[PDB]
Amino acid sequence: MKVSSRGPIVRWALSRPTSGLVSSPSEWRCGRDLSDEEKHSGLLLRIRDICQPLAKNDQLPVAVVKAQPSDLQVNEVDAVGDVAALSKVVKGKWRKISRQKTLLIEDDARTPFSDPSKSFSPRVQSYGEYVRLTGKLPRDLPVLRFVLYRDSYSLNSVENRLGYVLSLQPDCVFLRDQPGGSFGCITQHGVCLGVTKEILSHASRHYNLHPLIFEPREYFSTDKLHSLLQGARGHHHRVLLRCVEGSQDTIRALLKKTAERGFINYFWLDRFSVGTNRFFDMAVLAARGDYLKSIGALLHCVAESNGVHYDHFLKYLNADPSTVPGIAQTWATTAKHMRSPNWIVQLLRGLHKYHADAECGKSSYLAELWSALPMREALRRSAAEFVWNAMASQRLLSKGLNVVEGDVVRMTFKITDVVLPVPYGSVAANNCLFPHLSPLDKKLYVEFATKHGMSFLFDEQMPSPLSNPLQFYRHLITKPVNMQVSVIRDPNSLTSIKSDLAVMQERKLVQIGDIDYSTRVREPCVYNVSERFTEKMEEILKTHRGPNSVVLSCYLPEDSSPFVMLREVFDLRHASFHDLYGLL
């Protein structure tokens, strides 16, 4: 019995993206609109819908967001208040262990080899051998604090790179997830254990179009590990929308009203993949025990994310039960060869063993594989966040902006202070003070969880990950502390904003407080974007007649995706969306 899923298998990319157009679907090429996915994931309501008696009475202006990795830039702000900025670049140091090998070759051909005066000259075969310079690690300050700037790398990819370059285990590195899609440039603080500055710098890669750069700052004792792991207290988001309909006056008015009125603090799709089956769907399948379907959905999402996995998943699905073990073996071998993450490689190997050996041909083996799978906590957290989104939507639908006998943050309270609990297990369900309202309460929370199959997050408890500690109280709506906007005219969308690494390369310092029009913002010209970018954006331009490009820089308090605010303001479409596939 082979694994299976429920939704269609759509490969987002192309089998050969040679023209710059990566998205295979025509609508995705013209711009991916995740309105339906958001509605299914919980983002049902909108502040404008609440305000206006009607819903979607006036179509929101169309916009296209993060078509280039430089478009979205995120900088973390830790509880200590220090911002995450790219200060200086340090390269991995190497030590030469061997001497260059040379061979003597005849200098001239006319003179015979029998001549004692034969002239020979050396030619180098190997310049030498080098080894990464592992530094000395003091035993009193094992914890290393660093800052990481990643252009378009997912957190899972960063962890995998650390693991295979450095040979460490995932629990040795603590990187807090950063709101917004992973496609854009993201700079964040990080904490690691038992690593030295030299090797942590070796873990980086400076000579790639998408730079992943590490840099240590100082050592710390293990006592302050919890203090360093405390969740960040701010995020500076710099965004660039390419094709926005309207005019400068109306765009600025919309942004002014949005800033004044705040925006709902939903868990954007960065938490739950955009695939047909979501992380919470996988979690509920695993909880109810259909491990076969859970692993099938996991493979389905991985296939949608990656092309080769898509090629092999269909072969596995359509393989005759006689040849399915060989197809699974080939899939596992291909994953190992292309050097996919070890967890997926082992999952495919276990699937092959399950299909081959009759000993493993039982649900017990699949349950063991799922237990070994390290994503279970992430899936359960995604389910809890989905429940919180649904409950917040219901709260806004029932009560609205006004506050009546609702939970508030304990520093007449305001809606900004109004908060709702996100149930991260039985411990949260007990300790948290759920709102005492007749329609909405712990009873409705439990009813929704039971009807959607998420009863596990109330029946049992889930540990708080050390990398990103749980946040039980999440505000209802949030207002950017600072918000600067600029509007430019570019019907062909050649505008661009320089990244932190670009500023460092040109030797100026990086400022995170506000949008730097003189430095960060580049005026529209053909020499601002790549030719591949132009080829990719031509299809979008043939559909969206957006003469206005908006460059904005905002601050968000604890954890919020600027795409939520931009969704409440405009109707946004993501040209680059593969980053939302969290797994792999």
Binding site: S5, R6, G7, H40, G42, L44, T276, N277, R278, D281, M282, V284, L285, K293, A297, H300, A390, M391, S393, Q394, L397, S398, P439, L440, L444, E447, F448, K451, H452, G453
Partner: peptide, 12 residues
């Protein structure tokens, strides 16, 4: 309690 009906359940 309209969100329960608005958001249909799914089991992949």
């Amino acid at each position: 309690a309209a969100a329960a009906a608005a958001a249909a359940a799914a089991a992949a």
